[PDB]
Amino acid sequence: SQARVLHMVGDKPVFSFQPRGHLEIGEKLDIIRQSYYLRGAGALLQHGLVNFTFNKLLRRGFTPMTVPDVGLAGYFMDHTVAFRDLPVRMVCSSTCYRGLYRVHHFTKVEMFGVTGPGLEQSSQLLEEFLSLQMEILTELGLHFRVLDMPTQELGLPAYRKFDIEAWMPGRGRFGEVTSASNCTDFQSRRLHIMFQTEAGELQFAHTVNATACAVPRLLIALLESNQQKDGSVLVPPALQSYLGTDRITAPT
Amino acid sequence: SQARVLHMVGDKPVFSFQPRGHLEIGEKLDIIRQSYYLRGAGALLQHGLVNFTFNKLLRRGFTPMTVPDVGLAGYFMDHTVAFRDLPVRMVCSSTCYRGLYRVHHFTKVEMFGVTGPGLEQSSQLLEEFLSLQMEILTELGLHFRVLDMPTQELGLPAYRKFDIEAWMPGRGRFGEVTSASNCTDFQSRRLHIMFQTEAGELQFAHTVNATACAVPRLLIALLESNQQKDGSVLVPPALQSYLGTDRITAPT
């Protein structure tokens, strides 16, 4: 029916001032300009978010994939996986086409899974993906909530769907930053994504999808969460490696 | 009139066998699939080349920028730079739309320059860009040649243009992997990209463009150049960090 809050993580940052919007923050620091384009520390923040997520998923055994620009399931079309290969975990960074809240083009890192027979297998994989999303956001120090989306209402092609909303002080609200859904055999039956059972039968596999990183929405959450009174932005330690500093400051 | 070879770097690799095409190599190593799809070590090669070039340009003083996808000049439209800021060096990694030779989507790292008055300034900047390109290709261990493209013969919107062709054993020929052109005041006069002189006059600046990395063509050159008799393919040391190995050996 209605979305249920499954988890709260972190706390709302406390400000001695009225929090500013991400655009105001970015323009004052000259990291957001003009459509829109990121410059300097903003470009590095995009780079750092993507690489941080991609490397973390590489360490967990996800197989890297690069694609020309739905698609992820489509690559396994008419393909069959070995029982010894289940579960299949794939990670891919790609450009998607549809304030910076709603732009036409953006970079996103996606997780893709193909798993053994039935709900037990697909559900474990979905919870594993959800824990990766929660881990990534906690190490980035964001305050967020996990929501259990309805599935047989408003739609249908999903057995379970988890969304994660990060707190955005400037917007004054929670905003979706990632989603993870178990599609069971919906994609498999349409694309002939098969798996070989232990006994040797071919059966329609189960597929699981999850966003690992959406750069625009995480940039909004980070800038509005880590802003300072003087208009500077503190850099999360996980991203300090890529930015070369612990605080983004306005230019001279 | 016709292109002149300005520089030779490296030597053609020596094989005891007939060199294979990049597609054969990829299919045998399961790093190329399908359209086209890169998997495992192939995806790490692409991703790692982009990061290697991007980090090198960051260390050399280039300011990063990211765009939602011609464009590089277009963002400086109606902008004026201070004389003290010349030259402006920008580096951008982005997804571009146009074997792996001609796919519809691919990642490319571009160099962009805005420089002081006239040919002396723009030419120094163009030669700097060419030297960075040559440094990158040498550190990747590729054999290549730098060629002086004609400009007043067809063309026109270029005062000087350098192309670099990397040797591709499987194709049996040289293939363009990077390009660098000095466009002087063509782009500035059409996009109102100005610079302010010391005296206080505004004048059309000079623009310089150069490819820092085109992943498809470099992957082709690397796979075909570092291939072994076993179908293995050696990993250049600069990329061993990202691949975690010095040789791709195909799955069991």
Residues on chain A touching B93 (C-beta within 8 angstroms): 47
* Residue ranges in A70-228 assigned as alpha helix (H): 71-75, 118-139, 186-191, 215-226
Rounded CA separation A50/A44 (Å) = 10
Phi-psi region of A107 (alpha: psi -120 to 50; beta: other; left: phi over 0): beta
Within 10 angstroms of residue A194's Cβ, the number of other Cβ atoms is: 19
- Assigned domain for A203 exists: yes
- Assigned domain for B251 exists: no
Whole-angstrom CA distances from B45 to A18, A46, B32, B247 are 46, 21, 11, 12
Q: Are A209 and A181 in contact (CB under 8 A)?
A: yes
Annotated ligand binding at B176? The verdict is yes
End-to-end CA distance of chain B: 53
Q: Are A135 and A187 in contact (CB under 8 A)?
A: no
Contact check, Cβ <8 Å, B105/A93:
no
Strand order in the sheet with A193-196: A79-81, A193-196, A202-204
Q: Which of A44, A43, A42 is nearest to A28 (CA)?
A: A42
Q: Are A176 and A162 in contact (CB under 8 A)?
A: no
Annotated ligand binding at A197? The verdict is no
- Assigned domain for A207 exists: yes
Instruction: Using CB atoms within 10 Å of the CB of residue A158, give its burial: 0 to 12 exposed, 13 to 18 middle, 19+ buried.
Output: middle
Within 10 angstroms of residue A1's Cβ, the number of other Cβ atoms is: 7
The two most distant CA atoms of chain B are separated, in Å, by 70
Contact check, Cβ <8 Å, B40/A46:
no
Q: Which of B29, B66, B89 has the most A C-beta neighbours within 10 Å, making it the best mutation to test the interface with A?
A: B66
Q: Are A115 and A122 in contact (CB under 8 A)?
A: yes
Residues on chain B touching A105 (C-beta within 8 angstroms): 68-69
Could you tell me which chain A residue has the CA closest to the CA of B68? A105
Please list, in sequence order, all residues whose beta carbon lies within 8 angstroms of the beta carbon of residue B29, skipping any fewer than 6 positions away: B41, B42, B231, B232, B233, B248, B249, B250
- Assigned domain for A120 exists: yes
Q: Tokens 């998997």 label which residue? A: B39
Q: Which of B211, B213, B204, B206 is nearest to B88 (CA)?
A: B206
Whole-angstrom CA distances from B101 to A181, A220, B12, B222 are 35, 37, 21, 13
Annotated ligand binding at B98? The verdict is yes
Q: Are B69 and B75 in contact (CB under 8 A)?
A: no
Residues on chain B touching A94 (C-beta within 8 angstroms): 95
Rounded CA separation B239/B49 (Å) = 7
Rounded CA separation A173/B228 (Å) = 57
| Interface residues of chain A, partner chain B, Cβ below 8 Å | 33-40, 42-44, 46-47, 51, 54, 63-69, 75, 93-95, 103-106
Instruction: Report resolution (Å) to 1 decimal.
Output: 3.2
Token pair of A78 as six digits: 């008419």
- The approach used to solve this structure was X-ray
Rounded CA separation A90/A164 (Å) = 21
Chains A and B form CB pairs within 8 A to the count of 72
Q: Which of A37, A55, A108, A215 has the most B C-beta neighbours within 10 Å, making it the best mutation to test the interface with B?
A: A37
- Assigned domain for A51 exists: no
Q: Tokens 């780079």 label which residue? A: A47
- Assigned domain for B248 exists: no
Rounded CA separation A99/A216 (Å) = 10
Q: Are A67 and A91 in contact (CB under 8 A)?
A: no
Residues shown for chain A: 252
Q: Are A183 and A152 in contact (CB under 8 A)?
A: no
Q: How far A92 CA lies from chain B's nearest CA (Å)?
A: 9
- Assigned domain for A246 exists: no
Could you tell me which chain B residue has the CA closest to the CA of A55? B242
- Sign of the dihedral defined by the CA atoms of residues B18, B23, B24, B25, in that order: positive
Q: Which of A37, A39, A66, A243 has the most B C-beta neighbours within 10 Å, making it the best mutation to test the interface with B?
A: A66
Annotated ligand binding at A110? The verdict is yes
- Assigned domain for A44 exists: no
Whole-angstrom CA distances from B82 to A74, A235, B116, B188, B198 are 50, 29, 10, 15, 9
Q: How far B190 CA lies from chain A's nearest CA (Å)?
A: 19
Domain count, chain A: 1
Rg of chain A over Cα atoms, rounded to whole angstroms, equals 19
In one-letter notation, the amino acid at residue A247 is: R
After which residues are there C–N gaps above 2.5 Å in chain A? 34, 69, 98
CATH number of the domain at A9, please: 3.30.930.10
Q: How far A175 CA lies from chain B's nearest CA (Å)?
A: 21
Contact check, Cβ <8 Å, B43/A66:
yes
Rounded CA separation A199/A101 (Å) = 49
Residues shown for chain B: 252
Q: Which of B40, B78, B54 is nearest to A66 (CA)?
A: B40
Within 10 angstroms of residue A108's Cβ, the number of other Cβ atoms is: 19
Q: Which of B89, B71, B52, B39 is nearest to B213 (CA)?
A: B52
Q: Are B209 and B110 in contact (CB under 8 A)?
A: yes
Helix B215-225, helix B41-59: angle, nearest 10: 120
Rounded CA separation A206/A136 (Å) = 25
Rounded CA separation B72/B76 (Å) = 7
Annotated ligand binding at A139? The verdict is no
Residues on chain A touching B63 (C-beta within 8 angstroms): 39-40
In which domain, by residue range, is B204 found?
4-98+105-243
Contact check, Cβ <8 Å, B69/A95:
yes
